[PDB]
Write a protein that binds this ligand. Structure first.
Ligand SMILES: C=C1C(=O)NCCN1C(=O)N1C(c2ccc(OC)cc2OC(C)C)=N[C@@H](c2ccc(Cl)cc2)[C@H]1c1ccc(Cl)cc1
Ligand SMILES: C=C1C(=O)NCCN1C(=O)N1C(c2ccc(OC)cc2OC(C)C)=N[C@@H](c2ccc(Cl)cc2)[C@H]1c1ccc(Cl)cc1
Lengths: 87, 87
């Protein structure tokens, strides 16, 4: 019942998975983003809730990558990937 | 009381802000990451809790960028940056 209009880059992604409209509901945009991710297998094989933005199109939709200092898990994940134990 | 050993890339960042040890406490690594961010001004001017990973060193420490499908705010932020209203 409420339609939105994707900017060109998002429109291209939708069209890449077979959309043909110019305007979409929010549920539609979510469905097609999903489709793009599953069909290109951009999700982690082991933890499928995780999506990699290495794909240029999807990455670009995000804009400059950033994190919040409130994301403690993401920060400690980063730290521990760059540490070793002292024995 | 518990020391960890940064891998070379993290060590370089610490050394870039004046550290000289090879091993650190966790509080120390956090302090120096902080220092790097503030002194290079990688944080958003308007929302200072937000840090951009455009800086190559800091970005690389994170590895391939990813998001979780549980991050609803980050996903809708992305969607709405790529939409306009239909009038
Ligand atoms: C429902 C499913 C779903 O249950 N199965 C796969 C398709 N699928 C799906 O497309 N989605 C999922 C989602 C759930 C579990 C999951 O574990 C493996 C993986 C998911 O799928 C992505 C790995 C492809 N959750 C939705 C969602 C809806 C709204 C919001 Cl703000 C966030 C997420 C949607 C989706 C995913 C990513 C984006 Cl950018 C957009 C939509
Ligand atoms: C305390 C302060 C702090 O209060 N003031 C600035 C220095 N400062 C700081 O260095 N930090 C902050 C932090 C708080 C509010 C804030 O709003 C503007 C900005 C913050 O600072 C970054 C913008 C530079 N919170 C710590 C933290 C500690 C543990 C964890 Cl898992 C997460 C965050 C630490 C910090 C920040 C980023 C990284 Cl990668 C590592 C450490």
């Amino acid at each position: 019942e409420t339609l939105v209009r994707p900017k060109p880059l998002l429109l291209k992604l939708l069209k890449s998975v077979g959309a043909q409209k110019d305007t979409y509901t929010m549920k539609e945009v979510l469905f097609y983003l999903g489709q793009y991710i599953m069909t290109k297998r951009l999700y982690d094989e082991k933890q499928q809730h995780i999506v990699y933005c290495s794909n240029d199109l999807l990455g670009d939709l995000f804009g400059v990558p950033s994190f919040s200092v409130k994301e403690h898990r993401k920060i400690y994940t980063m730290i521990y990937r760059n540490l070793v134990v002292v024995n």
